[PDB]
Amino acid sequence: RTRSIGLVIPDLENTSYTRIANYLERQARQRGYQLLIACSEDQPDNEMRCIEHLLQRQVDAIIVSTSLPPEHPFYQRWANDPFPIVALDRALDREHFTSVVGADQDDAEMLAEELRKFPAETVLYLGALPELSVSFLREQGFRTAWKDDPREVHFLYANSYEREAAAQLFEKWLETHPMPQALFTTSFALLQGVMDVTLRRDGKLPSDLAIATFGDNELLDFLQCPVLAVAQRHRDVAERVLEIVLASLDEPRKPKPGLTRIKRNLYRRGVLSR
Template sequence: LRETRSYTWGLVIPDLTNFGFASIARSLEAHCREAGIQLLIACSEDDPALEQRVVDNLISRQVDGLIVASSGHSDDIYARIHDRLPVVQLDRHIGESRLPMVISDACKATAELVRDMASECGAEIYYFGGLLDLSPSRHRLAGYELGLHRAGLEADPARVRHRDYQPSSGYQLMAELVAELGAPPRGLFTASFTLLEGV
């Protein structure tokens, strides 16, 4: 009480069954444990209303800070929270937020992969993505288009398909594509592990 610290941090991620987020949560938990901090993990299911509830719940438990992979489009709530306790954006950039963030260069990594794929598959590389209002979705799609461009190919909008990041969406997108083509495509980029699992 004298230190006004709880030695806990809150981690808000969309889904613990997503391999990427589960790996991040595991590593963060180990680092926090080594530092004497308890990591409390909550899932938002990419639902902004649920995200707000789990964040409020973590704050009511007096966490010392929040690490959030947000599904929101505005950082107003997090900017107000940040006045009281640290908030770090994880994997996703909320609009034009100036809050601290840790994200990968999804555009660059995707462009390199797609360019390499194009050397074997030509232009027939399909793209399965998630919700375009999430920053990683936009960055990965931009990387797909850039990779094709660097391989000297044009991106065909008919080869770009979107749903959400659930495995069932990957399954449905692939079933529809195989029915349409009569065979699997020569190349396919999925914007998440969960979509790939469905494929």
């Protein structure tokens, strides 16, 4: 017992991971628990050796945001081990591990439901990598809220979740199709890309466009148009992850394996903050 918990995440560069790490650090310190941050750079081999380096340092538990294909046999080593691995953001084997993930589907529905209330003839759904779950979960939540609505929705998918990729595709798409009144993006990076194109061409970012995006930024309040944004309950996430770590260490018999979900918060910015 070193009264310490390993936390493996991609990097402390992403605000989402950092804010959760922030809330978790102040959470853990509060109970005389140290937190050991070992980043993977989202590389599988790095993660595996970040794990053992925590084990070498007599860590009491690990919290992981795994980059492996979860089933990958590495974590099946601790499948029936009382040593607790608690997953964050990206789930582990749902039969041998507790995982705190988000509720992308219900989130995407809520956000989509809200955007639809805005008048707009032409609508554009912009995502990326529909092969992935986060991409599909979000599309499904959206399609759910736009089921019996008459309006046609143009769907457009980029090769990656990047600013440049979105910029290129949206610009190419503007040749055939015209500018939309309503927009739905599944990451902030996509919206950036779309905005770059609108700053080009127009010179002026829009004041006649309902924006709806995943991820949140406070600087969206300066925009001249209505924007809707969803972001994680970073603190509420941290609480739940830690409660499970403590339950496994303290209580007799660990919590049930499987997913537990936490919904995002909606934010009305741009003109909706006035």
